[PDB]
């Protein structure tokens, strides 16, 4: 569990970078991309996949987009 939690940030970093490079997609598309990115590293539940994407702003690396409840945009 600790290894999965540690690798969650690394897996979600790529998703956050892709979202920042795109900044325009469906609300569920952002969650699906995050789930697919973390599928290769481990097998997280959909709630865990959503939490990993939502915690990107809390990682002290980028920010989030409060306008969309599901789509997240990373400033950096």
């Amino acid at each position: 569990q600790k290894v999965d939690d540690d690798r969650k940030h690394e897996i979600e970093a790529a998703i956050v970078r892709i979202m920042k490079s795109r900044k325009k997609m469906q609300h569920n598309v952002l969650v699906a991309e995050v789930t697919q990115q973390l599928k290769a590293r481990f097998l997280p539940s959909p709630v865990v996949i959503k939490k990993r994407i939502e915690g990107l702003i809390e990682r002290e690396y980028l920010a989030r987009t409060p306008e969309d409840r599901k789509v997240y945009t990373y400033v950096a």
Partner: protein
């Protein structure tokens, strides 16, 4: 144990062998804060991605 002075690791205000990616003896929060602007760590001239 690493002779890197565990009393002060970096600018994190969270206190502090273990092998990482920059070998700068920095906490997880400090590494993330540093990577918020530049991913390159200015301590080993190599790409840093953190570990453990």
């Amino acid at each position: 144990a690493w002779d890197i002075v565990v009393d002060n690791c970096a600018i994190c205000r969270n206190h502090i062998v273990a092998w990482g990616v920059c070998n700068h003896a920095f906490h997880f929060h400090c590494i993330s804060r540093w990577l918020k602007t530049r991913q390159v760590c200015p301590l080993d001239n190599r790409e840093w991605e953190f570990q453990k």
